[PDB]
Write a protein that binds this ligand. Structure first.
Ligand SMILES: Nc1ncnc2c1ncn2[C@@H]1O[C@H](COP(=O)(O)OP(=O)(O)NP(=O)(O)O)[C@@H](O)[C@H]1O
Ligand SMILES: [Mg+2]
Ligand SMILES: [Zn+2]
Lengths: 459, 799, 327
């Protein structure tokens, strides 16, 4: 659980080696000392893992821009050292979650055996490579390798989700409802490249709903406006008055009816199973929305949310924007979370009323009851020198593109503290009152109109 | 034949022989042939028990296995915690909940069979060992044959799947006592296997391994010319089915209705598939086959339907049948379930025209609101919920198309068109499901009527509000008016008030309905009113307790046996679809089991070791119910308090009754803690009073006194709680001198609690709180050197 | 607790039950005690007579206070005026007698007797109205006199005001159950409805929720639901709001507003005050609960109430002036 941690710090500048401030060299030198101490007693494990780490960095640095139009799988070039390495009995799979035991002896752990010769690609501004890792048991595991991006922020957000999951488990009110947050392992390897878990059996909500070829909206409502038509209209009214934006949004919403409720109907024909999956979906959305609001999660567009096909549970990815840094964007995020018409429509005929509202209240009570715990954890994160959670113009322009640190951290902590005590506009609000305000703000059509078209508020 | 390798596997899975001298030699052989690999844990015993069920469907043969399963559950309660700790990740396929469902299914098979009483008692005893443990699931799932599901995947053609299902049913029905059924079946096998489709089925299905292939070898024959099914062209194929009387005879004769309806479909010339026409002789001898084949026949007709003539005819006849159900006529539950299966089967079929699942749900032009009500009437809660959502979606699409509305608005149109309110319908569907959060989804319908308000108060444990509403409103029927009142009074304590209130009702009324027997007996045994003296649950419990006092053990076990059997029979006849329906039965069975366990201890001599083991067993099973609702745990705790008090009122000339007094005091403290967790204040106050009846105030303080301070703190009485603890601390300082290890934990906890309470109330400066309460608690637990304990380690951590 | 003496044990139980409503429960509980015990002590006799007249248990039939009150009410029922005044005279003379023998040093000691003497006086005052013909003018003057004396008790404790209001409800309801072939009983029904609304408001001020719910139920016995809404229905929404049931209160008022919009067309001056207040209350409740955006709350509830109160031009009134100020 720590050998990959230290190497990532020690391999901060190994990206250009294979192809600043005094704190950087001091951290790098100290990390090297730990590695030598680690290698003193177990040299075979250290040498084996660093070879695997180097292979990931070399694989990440591969350009591979020619196969952008290919979606069938590209054979890995023989020059990559990842193909040479096989049967690493001393390396445990970084993608898998390793249970922590009190004893110092680790046994019967799944180790890396080999890697498949075929790798896939995923859409985006960059081209990440999807590789398959074969464990000791012979079960294949899918890993996502990302280049030209920082993965340490995602790893930090994953732990907070674990703390939120751990807090929810120990309370009887939320443990009965099985209120949990979907998490995926993130293993940073350097300051520029990294590897993270690929959620098998999951599809983006945008891909399922507004796909050009076989989208849910097109299949169920052919006579309604197409996804391209709605996107084009919103961009036209972008440089217009607020009133013009509102009437455009209402016009688009009139000719765009949600069809997300059909996801459970076409995948779970059994009424008993269908009810369980719909209930799990409603609980997952309610739990994630409250936690995301508490942590100030932003940029929750269609491509940043994944839904499990087997379990119908939402998975949140791309957690770089948090702590209400989304309101600092040129187009502010006026919604605490995503509660669009598609999200509400998939909850059943009752909508937000019922399971969603009660689960949100139960989650808020747990958050309020663990305020001292939650505030302390965030305080540790906010003072991390390597945690670049603050917003910069380069990140702000990249997020929305079209064709004193101490004072900020204290303000964020104060804003988090007032949220956990229910203070919203200088007044004390109960758990039920705070939940109602959050639900109302998210579903308010006026707030959705001001939002960026890329967020797809109408979706 | 123990050494036989091919017979080795099956001899291991057979049910153990009954415990008798005649079955001695076979018993050691079976115990050794099964335990040859090694000892089996509790999980392995459960897995072994479930595997035997799928072999033979006779509950009598499983009587010994039920007793064996009871023994493992009783003496291995520690491993049930680990089993549940392994199943919260995937609670849908939880091993424990599958056992509960399997036992209940076995009980259903035992209904209307010889020797049904002992098998139900064994299941109830097995269901008494495991209580209403929170299974983290809502929908009950039934075990399905993996091989049967796998075999369906091999065939891609829909007709081939029809062939396999029929032959599998035909192969299954070759072993009953009836000879006409056997003769009719074998003729069908000869006819089906001689056709081209049957010939094509064998080639695909011969690759896999299945005993049915060997059974069907004699019937199959090789012929140059394939069997030809004659096709007749009726002048008007629709005249046979266009009869409202034929679709709804409903003369309390379901057997002839399904047979005539199936036969009419066969005689119609619409059917195209050849295998179906050959099923007529078998349909005429079995009603179950007619129900099974009917969805396939209806599906077959609509495939070659032209100009939507068959679709329109079937849509209006099926809808007419459903409308007849909404009347008040008086249709049998079997007929409605058969039509529901037809609707459910058609919903899973892809229409010939390209479309989605929503289009596939409308093979026939049907009003799903009526079907949902029928499904709710047939206790198909999840099926009704899905149908209601489909009905609402269809009308919303229809309204949008017509124009080219909230749940309250849509219900208004539904009432004025078909007489059924959609939002009202959704109410009992969610109540039948029993999920607490879904009740708030559809509550806007019927807000102001007291009945709807009363359930909300009872669900939220607002007993004071419910009690006022019950007294105020008079239009509510009297039978349920007091039923709430006694129920509300009991949850608030008020035992003396309830006793007088019950006496007042009996004075003013001579006619006495049975559901007031149930509550009066419930109050009589709870209040130890022993002078009050088919049989009901609380009647059996009250009778058994009096039998326990009078040492009448012969009737004490008989009354418990009758109660245990009676609980299962009422459990068998319900829907068995919602997990929340299992909890009230499991809790009552657990209470019966605990009383039965005490009977052997009561009958023989009383000793400290036996009582300590019972309390350890009680606490071991109690923590297994930590996630259970208070409504399912309170009756169990109430019985435990009573039976412990029954032991104390017994004569003890041995002067050892202090052991029972300590156990009762510890149990009542735990009851106060459990009630405090569930935001209840009346019950903890009553438990404290009961403790003070048997306990006094001495120099050495006790734990229940500290509990009283916590109870008063929960009652928002901070001055009372602080005064109790300050006096308690003052006595502790003067009494103990670092000499009593038992008082060390109480003194350390008391100082810590008082310091925390003072800090929260801001009634003392930080300097005094640390100097007098906080650091002293750390000091007391630290320098007393009373180490080598686990409770101290927990106490030191908190300090 | 059981170590407490029995004589005061049921005395507290009956008194606690009465303050929480539970009239049917108390009646059955009283019947149960009489069944299990034959000895009948005066202090239990005092409470049983108090419950009998409060619950109109007229079939139960020196003299004490509640005994005289119960006897006088039956005398009022039977038109036996000779004994009705004599019983009230004996009660009035008796009540002063205990006050004479006390210390007379604490002002708080005088309050229970003054409240009891006020109740006796009100019953005596209405006796002359009962004996002669019933007219609208006499009934209005009595209610105005009751209201004028009630505001003089605005600083009194609820324990000294509740018995007075309880007798007024009993007196008014006794008038309704009298035979009236003149078809003018609607005047008493309106007076009782107004009195019960005031009782609900007074009980709500003293942080009491059981009594306002009982008063609402009593109103619904003599009233129904029509196109034109009334004030007691608005009072029910306020009562449910005090019971920490926000969804129930909002649903009542939203249904009430929808009915008002369809029913009135700026034609009924009486419904103008109800419509303006109801929109204002619902908007304030929605704002506090944060269940609606500010734009809709102002557009639908707040500014609408101002528009209704102002643009309807139903001026020249004092209640409407108070309504506009609140709006
Ligand atoms: N952990 C994951 N599990 C499964 N699929 C993932 C995961 N992360 C990303 N994806 C997929 O990759 C697609 C692109 O997202 P991502 O890999 O984050 O690149 P991106 O859109 O460029 N994010 P960013 O680099 O911060 O701008 C998503 O739409 C998902 O389908
Ligand atoms: Mg993204
Ligand atoms: Zn009928």
């Amino acid at each position: 659980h720590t050998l990959f941690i230290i190497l990532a710090l020690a391999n901060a500048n190994r990206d250009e080696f294979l192809t600043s401030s005094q704190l950087d060299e001091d951290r790098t030198e100290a990390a090297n000392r730990i590695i030598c101490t680690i290698r003193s007693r177990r040299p075979q494990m250290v040498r084996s893992v660093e070879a695997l780490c180097d292979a990931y960095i070399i694989l990440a640095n591969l350009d591979a821009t020619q196969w952008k139009t290919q979606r069938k799988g590209i054979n890995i070039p023989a020059d990559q050292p990842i193909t040479k390495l096989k049967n690493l009995e001393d390396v445990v799979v970084p993608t898998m979650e390793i249970k922590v035991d009190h004893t110092g002896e680790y046994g019967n752990l799944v180790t890396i055996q080999s890697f498949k010769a075929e790798f896939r690609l995923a859409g985006g501004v960059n081209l990440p490579k999807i590789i398959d890792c074969v464990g000791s048991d012979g079960k294949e595991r899918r890993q996502l390798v990302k280049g030209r991006d920082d993965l340490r922020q995602d790893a930090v957000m994953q732990q907070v989700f674990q703390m939120c999951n751990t807090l929810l488990q120990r309370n009887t009110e939320t443990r009965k409802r099985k209120l949990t947050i979907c998490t995926y392992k993130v293993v940073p390897l350097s300051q520029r490249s990294g590897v993270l878990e690929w959620c098998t059996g999951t599809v983006p909500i945008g891909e399922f709903l507004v796909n050009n070829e076989d989208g849910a909206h097109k299949r169920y409502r052919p006579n309604d406006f197409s996804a391209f038509q709605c996107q084009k209209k919103m961009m036209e009214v972008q440089k217009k008055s607020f009133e013009e934006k509102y009437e455009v949004f209402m016009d688009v919403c009139q000719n765009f009816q949600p069809v997300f409720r059909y996801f459970c109907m076409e995948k779970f024909l059994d009424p008993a199973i269908w009810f369980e999956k719909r209930l799990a979906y409603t609980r997952s959305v309610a739990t994630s929305s409250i936690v995301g609001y508490i942590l100030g999660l932003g940029d929750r567009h269609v491509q940043n949310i994944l839904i499990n096909e087997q379990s119908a549970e939402l998975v949140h990815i791309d957690l770089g924007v948090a702590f209400e840094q989304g309101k600092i964007l040129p187009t502010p995020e006026t919604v605490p979370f995503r509660l669009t018409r598609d999200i509400v429509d998939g909850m059943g005929i009752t909508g937000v009323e019922g399971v969603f509202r009660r689960c949100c209240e139960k989650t808020m009570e747990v958050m309020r009851n663990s305020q001292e715990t939650l505030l302390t954890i965030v305080e540790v994160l906010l003072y991390d020198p390597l945690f670049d959670w603050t917003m910069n113009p380069l990140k702000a322009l990249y997020l929305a593109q079209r064709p004193s640190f101490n004072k900020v951290a204290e303000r964020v902590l104060m804003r988090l503290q007032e949220k956990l005590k229910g203070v919203e506009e200088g007044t004390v609000l109960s758990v039920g009152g705070q939940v109602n305000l959050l639900i109302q703000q998210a579903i308010d059509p006026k707030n959705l109109s001001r939002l960026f078209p890329g967020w797809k508020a109408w979706v | 034949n123990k050494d036989n390798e091919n017979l080795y596997i099956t001899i291991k899975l057979l049910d153990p022989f009954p415990d008798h001298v005649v079955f001695k030699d076979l018993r050691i052989t079976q115990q050794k042939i099964k335990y040859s690999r090694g000892p089996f844990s509790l999980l392995e015993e459960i897995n072994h028990f479930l595997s035997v069920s799928v072999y033979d469907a006779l509950p009598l043969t499983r009587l010994e296995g039920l007793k064996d399963l009871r023994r493992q559950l009783e003496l291995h309660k520690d491993q049930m915690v680990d089993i549940m700790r392994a199943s919260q990740d995937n609670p849908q396929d939880g091993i424990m909940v599958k056992l509960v469902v399997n036992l209940l299914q076995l009980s259903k098979m035992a209904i209307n069979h010889t020797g049904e009483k002992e098998v139900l008692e064994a299941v109830g005893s097995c269901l008494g060992e495991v209580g209403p443990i929170d299974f983290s699931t809502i929908a009950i799932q039934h075990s399905k044959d993996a091989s049967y599901t796998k075999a369906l995947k091999l065939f891609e053609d829909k007709e081939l799947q029809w062939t396999f299902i029929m032959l599998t049913y035909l192969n299954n029905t070759l072993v009953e006592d009836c000879v006409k059924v056997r003769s009719a079946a074998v003729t069908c096998l000869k006819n089906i296997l001689a056709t081209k489709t049957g010939h094509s089925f064998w080639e695909i299905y011969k690759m896999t391994t299945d005993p049915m292939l060997a059974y069907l070898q004699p019937f199959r024959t090789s012929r140059k010319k394939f069997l030809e099914v004659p096709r007749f062209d009726k002048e008007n194929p629709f005249e046979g089915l266009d009869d409202i009387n034929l679709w709804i005879p409903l003369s309390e004769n379901h057997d002839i209705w399904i047979k005539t309806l199936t036969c009419a479909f066969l005689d119609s010339g619409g059917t195209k598939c050849e295998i179906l026409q050959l099923l007529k002789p078998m349909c005429e001898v079995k009603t179950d086959f007619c129900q099974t084949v009917l969805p396939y026949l209806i599906h077959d007709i609509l495939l070659q339907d032209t100009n939507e003539s068959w679709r329109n005819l079937l849509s209006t006849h099926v809808q007419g049948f459903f409308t007849s159900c909404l009347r008040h006529c008086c249709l049998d539950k079997k007929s409605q379930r058969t039509m529901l299966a037809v609707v459910d089967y058609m919903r899973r079929q892809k229409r010939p025209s390209s479309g989605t699942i929503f289009n596939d749900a409308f093979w026939l032009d049907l009003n799903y609101l009526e079907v949902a009500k029928v499904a709710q009437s047939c206790a198909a809660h999840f099926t009704a919920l899905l149908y209601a959502e489909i009905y609402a979606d269809k009308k919303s699409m229809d309204d949008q198309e017509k124009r080219s509305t909230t749940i309250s608005s849509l219900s208004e149109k539904s009432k004025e068109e078909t007489g059924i309110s959609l939002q009202d319908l959704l109410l009992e569907i969610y109540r039948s499901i029993g999920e607490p959060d879904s009740l708030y989804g559809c509550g806007g319908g019927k807000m102001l009527q007291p009945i709807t308000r009363l359930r909300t108060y009872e669900h939220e444990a607002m007993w004071g509000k419910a009690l006022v509403t019950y007294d105020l409103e008079t239009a509510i029927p009297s039978s349920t008016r007091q039923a709430g009142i006694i129920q509300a009074l009991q949850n608030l304590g008020l035992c003396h008030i309830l006793s007088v209130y019950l006496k007042g009702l009996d004075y003013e009324n001579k006619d006495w309905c049975p559901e007031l027997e149930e509550l009066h007996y419930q109050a009589a045994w709870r209040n130890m009113q022993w002078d009050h003296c088919g049989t009901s649950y609380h009647e059996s419990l009250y009778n058994a307790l009096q039998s326990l006092r009078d040492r009448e053990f012969s009737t004490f076990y008989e009354s418990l046996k009758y109660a245990r059997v009676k609980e299962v029979e009422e459990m068998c006849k319900r829907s068995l679809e919602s997990v929340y329906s299992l909890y009230p039965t499991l809790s009552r069975l657990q209470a019966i089991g605990e009383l039965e366990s005490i009977g052997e201890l009561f009958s023989r001599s009383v000793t400290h070791r036996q009582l300590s083991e019972v309390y350890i067993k009680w606490q071991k099973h109690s923590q297994l119910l930590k996630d259970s609702d208070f409504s399912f745990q309170e009756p169990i705790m109430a019985l435990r308090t009573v039976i412990l008090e029954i032991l104390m009122e017994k004569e003890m000339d041995n002067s050892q009754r202090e052991c029972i007094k300590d156990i009762l005091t510890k149990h009542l403290v735990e009851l106060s803690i459990l009630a405090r967790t569930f935001k209840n204040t009346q019950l903890p106050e009553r438990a404290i009073f009961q403790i003070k009846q048997y306990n006094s105030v001495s120099c050495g303080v006790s734990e229940w006194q500290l509990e009283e301070a916590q109870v008063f703190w929960a009652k928002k009485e901070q001055s009372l709680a602080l005064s109790i603890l300050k006096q308690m601390i003052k006595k502790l300082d003067a009494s103990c001198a670092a000499n009593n290890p038992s008082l060390k934990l109480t003194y350390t906890e008391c100082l810590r609690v008082c310091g925390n309470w003072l800090a929260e109330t801001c009634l003392e400066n930080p300097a005094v709180i640390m100097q007098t309460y906080l650091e002293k608690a750390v000091e007391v637990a630290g320098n007393y050197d009373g180490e080598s304990s686990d409770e101290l380690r927990n106490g030191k951590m908190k300090a």
